[PDB]
Design a protein around this ligand. Structure first.
Ligand SMILES: *[C@@H]1O[C@H](CO)[C@@H](O[C@@H]2O[C@H](CO)[C@@H](O[C@@H]3O[C@H](CO[C@H]4O[C@H](CO)[C@@H](O)[C@H](O)[C@@H]4O)[C@@H](O)[C@H](O[C@H]4O[C@H](CO)[C@@H](O)[C@H](O)[C@@H]4O)[C@@H]3O)[C@H](O)[C@H]2NC(C)=O)[C@H](O)[C@H]1NC(C)=O
Ligand SMILES: Cn1c(=O)cc(OCc2cn([C@@H]3C[C@H]4CC[C@@H](C3)[N+]4(C)C)nn2)c2ccccc21
Ligand SMILES: Cn1c(=O)cc(OCc2cn([C@@H]3C[C@H]4CC[C@@H](C3)[N+]4(C)C)nn2)c2ccccc21
Ligand SMILES: Cn1c(=O)cc(OCc2cn([C@@H]3C[C@H]4CC[C@@H](C3)[N+]4(C)C)nn2)c2ccccc21
Ligand SMILES: Cn1c(=O)cc(OCc2cn([C@@H]3C[C@H]4CC[C@@H](C3)[N+]4(C)C)nn2)c2ccccc21
Ligand SMILES: Cn1c(=O)cc(OCc2cn([C@@H]3C[C@H]4CC[C@@H](C3)[N+]4(C)C)nn2)c2ccccc21
Ligand SMILES: *[C@@H]1O[C@H](CO)[C@@H](O)[C@H](O)[C@H]1NC(C)=O
Lengths: 206, 213, 209, 209, 211
């Protein structure tokens, strides 16, 4: 019985995993949302600030679809992010390699939906000057696909408000506002427009 | 003695046979087939308390225990082999994660687990962790108080359930010469809902009260 | 249909990659790599060790006959993205780094049907620089060469589309402002070897804001 | 003959490593690992965190029947060097480390025809130590235990050749001088397990030069 | 093309060499090897007087020769040599004996093999090693030394040789915090009371001061 549930899952996974990424003819849309945990450090000597957050990522591939009834009513499953394609979303203004704080495992559901929530620590270019005043300091960093134009990967948010509800209450810095906004930008390298979600944080000393 | 040397050879052959048989992977737990992970903490040292960033550094090891049917075997079929140590990469392990780390955890111990014939698995990773903590008052008689939650990152309370044996973090190995003394340390199972997921997730809350020695 | 384009792309990649791997350039079959720099930030200048840390991305471009395909055979697919591990990439290396380069970006390249390849790794580099004068109107000047480590100019040759480093993306709040940034192809002779090595010399003049 | 010596050695390694594969020690077939330490340097003593950083060589010796061979069948080859990854190695772990150890030497071991292995990894270790007193004539005393993480004494037992740490490579110019260094086998129980675990206790007494 | 045949030959060569036969077991007493070694010193980056560690940037030139890497160019379309990944071949275990940190690799690991079985390999490294920099702010400067050599092979298996005993300073960074008074690289033979076999290292001695 409980073996039957396993047999069906191993079945489903084996049937499935036997994807070249998106293209202009097969475009993929990624929904991004940020949950900001902490502003760990603000370095005025280098103008770098360190964030800890979660990035929620959602997209859909028909190549991931299946009929639950054939697979014993299995709606969804966890799998290693290595077992599937995942999008290349990248901070455009990092000063160091992002460090991954959580297991890389995604949830795949029968309709082809994939949901993935990497927690990360990020050092990025920010000038904290004013962080000790009432107005505080403002910094911004864009997140987007590195190699994929708007014609291939589109970016969406469900809300322009960063989720602050997990922000660390004892942080050295308190958040005044945090917004996540979709943008369309052009770059020297390429004629095609690239999409980003601009994360803007306004913060000050506690 | 030829017999004794033949005996040792047989045990080896028996062990390899057992390992090859079992490793011919388990998909992970499901709402249909939930799994309970037992968890306890042994706190060795509070290495550093950084009042400039509100990050605190711990060294500890977590005992993880769980049980799987697919890891069961009859010892009499395998020459009285009750248990074996095996690389942790060889088997499924739980994704237990600090919820409030500021840096990737650094692994201080070999990752190898003990598997027993009833399907029991024991695993004790030792770790150094930076997590979010305000050590204000650490220099005071009552010291400072910090907390960090550990639980599965991707599996709700319907897939992975957590339990402790005791609510006392084990202090018997705590470094006597540490810069910080422990006023107390407890480990408590909790149930919480998070915005991303409708299902409740379980964590074990490590709460530590400490001050400068 | 979108299934077909997907089927065609997978087929195209299996044909190009599974049919071994280009062993690299040779005296018989040399290769020109085009290089250009986009300077995002001067993060840190350490006057105690004389190391400066740059954040930049490096555009690299080259072309291999063995990467060509006829689009009409493969669905009029004119190009694709592929992981940089699936193809040969040039060994371009800073000659005066003090630390291993840190990669800030996904490593994925764009291959085109004419066989051209385009790749843009973003990197943080610590290199040897004396920031003395950085506090003055004139500022400080430093230079670092980028070139193949193992391939002389009979094997790999280097080219720039301009001698002007791209500052369009330079961080406006950086501790350091850039006075000038140039990138210049050099034919460099080393007494170790009979054959010249080719590099692109990056020269940055900068000062505290 | 050079090909023959080479050919014999390749055959030997193939015979050994393709043979029916030691799954590691068990209670039925326990193992004694001999451990000795050669202290190179005390690099750093941090009194703000109570950590101390040590550089040292750890000599490890054990013997497996499954590694035995007759030199005669193999051209009188007595011993060979092999990658440490080609064989089983013990899990010896420092019990008090505050950071993952950093390996300073290649991982290659020597295997001799009696089944003996000799493996000497060089390491930099940060471990828990209170430096207090280091600046006095008495100096400071610190201790760290090394033993198997996952194997009880019924599976792995330890021994030393001497109670005396080898000080012959200790760096003459170190910020710290060594007053005494000992290495002593201990037996110990831990909350986790009924079985005793064996460790070798490294005790160092030191002060500022 | 003829450029197409060039690729086929090279590939044919590399396969015949690398795929064919057993992996080179490494040198032995019966089949000993000589490694030639030289240092080009680029920079003294840092001198820490609180830990007595000094950080060097340099590249090493390593050369050795193996019969198992030989080929006749005529057989192979007259290719006299090629570049190959260092993972494709055996490389020597040359190691600093007095380092305090894992060496950091600054250069692509790729070596050049020539038809006579000769290999040249030029790793660039940043190395922290035990050095007391005391006197660096004086006129006579500081002197430090570090030995390099095989970790696991005695003089009977691996022998070391230098082309010159002068460290190459021609590439030294002229704006370095530290200026070099002298740098030498000298072969040394050591014996240990236990054993008749010699042990071989190249001793790098550097005298330097604040610029
Ligand atoms: C692998 O290594 C082994 C062991 O070292 C070598 O085997 C030995 O080979 C040497 C060289 O032939 C042999 O040395 C000879 O010993 C003879 C007497 O041996 C007898 O008695 C012994 C026991 O004491 C028995 O084990 C053995 O079977 C015999 O019954 C001497 O009479 C020889 O001396 C004469 O010859 C030498 C030159 O060979 C002259 O210089 C002397 O002046 C004299 O005329 C000789 O010294 C030895 O016996 C072998 N040992 C065994 C046990 O076999 C292998 O050769 C080696 N394989 C290699 C290197 O390929
Ligand atoms: C001509 N041409 C194209 O049309 C599309 C390319 O797409 C692939 C790509 C694009 N980028 C960059 C990374 C960073 C910088 C600007 C933007 C696009 N960015 C912010 C996301 N990195 N890889 C391309 C890549 C290299 C050379 C020419 C190219
Ligand atoms: C809609 N939805 C689900 O119903 C269940 C999911 O479960 C998998 C999962 C859950 N989490 C988080 C990681 C961190 C934050 C909250 C909690 C759960 N947490 C503390 C462990 N990360 N991945 C899920 C994942 C991504 C997007 C939508 C989802
Ligand atoms: C004579 N000869 C060769 O022609 C090519 C060699 O290999 C290619 C190579 C070259 N370099 C270095 C890297 C850096 C520093 C100086 C120059 C040459 N550089 C700027 C490109 N590193 N690897 C080689 C290797 C050892 C001995 C003689 C050699
Ligand atoms: C009941 N039981 C056993 O009998 C044997 C086990 O052996 C495997 C093991 C044991 N340790 C620890 C690591 C550290 C701390 C105590 C000691 C043993 N230590 C100093 C070496 N690490 N892995 C075991 C593991 C987890 C839970 C119960 C167990
Ligand atoms: C008896 N015996 C041998 O004859 C040869 C061995 O060769 C392997 C080896 C030797 N070394 C060290 C590293 C450093 C310090 C001394 C020298 C030899 N060193 C400078 C190269 N590191 N690995 C060996 C290894 C372990 C136990 C006994 C041994
Ligand atoms: C190689 O060079 C030789 C000259 O010695 C020439 O005869 C030959 O045609 C060339 N190529 C081959 C494959 O022999």
């Amino acid at each position: 019985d409980k073996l039957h549930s396993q047999a069906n899952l191993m079945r489903l996974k084996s049937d499935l995993f036997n994807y070249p990424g998106p293209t202009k003819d097969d475009p993929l849309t990624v929904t991004l949302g940020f949950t900001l945990q902490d502003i760990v450090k603000a370095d005025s000597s280098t103008n770098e600030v360190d964030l800890v957050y979660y990035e929620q990522q959602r997209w859909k591939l028909n190549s991931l679809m299946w009929d639950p009834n054939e697979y014993g009513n299995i709606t969804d499953f966890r799998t290693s992010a290595a077992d599937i394609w995942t999008p290349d979303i990248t901070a455009y203004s990092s000063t160091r390699p992002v460090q991954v704080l959580s297991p890389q495992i995604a949830v795949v559901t029968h309709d082809g939906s994939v949901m993935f929530i990497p927690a990360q620590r990020l050092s990025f270019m920010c000038d904290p000057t004013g962080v000790d005043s009432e107005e505080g300091a403002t910094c911004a960093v864009k997140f987007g696909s590195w190699v994929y134009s708007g014609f291939e990967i589109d970016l969406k948010t469900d809300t322009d408000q960063v989720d602050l509800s997990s922000y660390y209450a004892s942080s050295k810095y308190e958040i005044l506002s945090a917004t996540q906004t979709r943008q369309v930008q052009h770059y020297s390298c390429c004629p095609e427009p690239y999409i980003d979600v601009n994360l803007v944080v306004k913060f000050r000393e506690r």
